[PDB]
Every structure is written in structure tokens, then in C-alpha cells.
């Protein structure tokens, strides 16, 4: 059910702060990287930090954040590429996608594209 986002960008899991804050960790052990992906329409998910009890959200910006509440910012293109690994494009803001750098602070979705490793990510159990 539950799973953890490792990025290929430094081997950093997707963090999900109970204040809202997203960033990436290293350690398996952080209870804040276990993650709920639900499916919406096909292909388009939502993806929750169970700990947390937080949505991620892409906003207007480029800026990534956790909401309580399920909006708009909150569903995301689940791809899987020819490499094997998930992208996750924002479904409002269509060219943009979540992304961890290899200091493991998020980037901003206004600075990704295709061919970055920072987008790539491979769900694993947790």
C-alpha cells in the first residue's frame, strides 16, 4: 500500500513534513517518507504523506508544499518512461514536474523538464 519515492538525483526519498514542508531524505528509517499514491482518473494520482496527513501540491510558482485539503494543485500525471522509472507532471500546471536536487532541497517545478534525473523517481514498498 504505502511507499517511498527514491529519486534518482542523489538517491533522496520524498519527505513529507507534518508542517507542510517537503524536502528529501536519505534514511529509510524517516517515518515521513511513507507515502499513500491514490489513483483519481487513470494514469492521475494524488500522493499523501501518511504521517504527515498532507497532500502535495505544486503551486503557481513552481513552489512544492503539503496541504491538508485536496485541491486542484494536488493531482499529478503519473508516467511510466522508457527508462522504468515515474515521473509525476502537474496536472494543472502542465509542464511542470516534482522534483528533488541533489543537495536534497526540492526544485522548483518551473525549473524541470524531460531529461533531468531530478525527475525521475522509482516507488518502492515500505
Not at 8 to 37: A, C, Y
Not at 67 to 80: A, G, I
Not at 110 to 118: D, E, L, V, Y
Request: net charge positive; aromatic share 12%; with cysteine.
Amino acid at each position: 500500500d504505502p511507499k517511498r519515492l527514491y529519486c534518482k538525483n542523489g538517491g533522496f526519498f520524498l519527505r513529507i513534513h507534518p508542517d507542510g514542508r517537503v524536502d528529501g531524505v536519505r534514511e529509510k528509517s524517516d517515518p515521513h517518507i511513507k507515502l499513500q499514491l491514490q489513483a483519481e482518473e487513470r494514469g492521475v494520482v494524488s500522493i499523501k504523506g501518511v504521517s504527515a496527513n498532507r497532500y502535495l501540491a505544486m503551486k503557481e510558482d513552481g513552489r512544492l508544499l503539503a496541504s491538508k485539503s485536496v485541491t486542484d494543485e494536488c493531482f499529478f500525471f503519473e508516467r511510466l518512461e522508457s527508462n522504468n522509472y515515474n515521473t509525476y507532471r502537474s496536472r494543472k500546471y502542465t509542464s511542470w514536474y516534482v522534483a528533488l536536487k541533489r543537495t536534497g532541497q526540492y526544485k522548483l517545478g518551473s525549473k524541470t523538464g524531460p531529461g533531468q534525473k531530478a525527475i525521475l523517481f522509482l516507488p518502492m514498498s515500505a
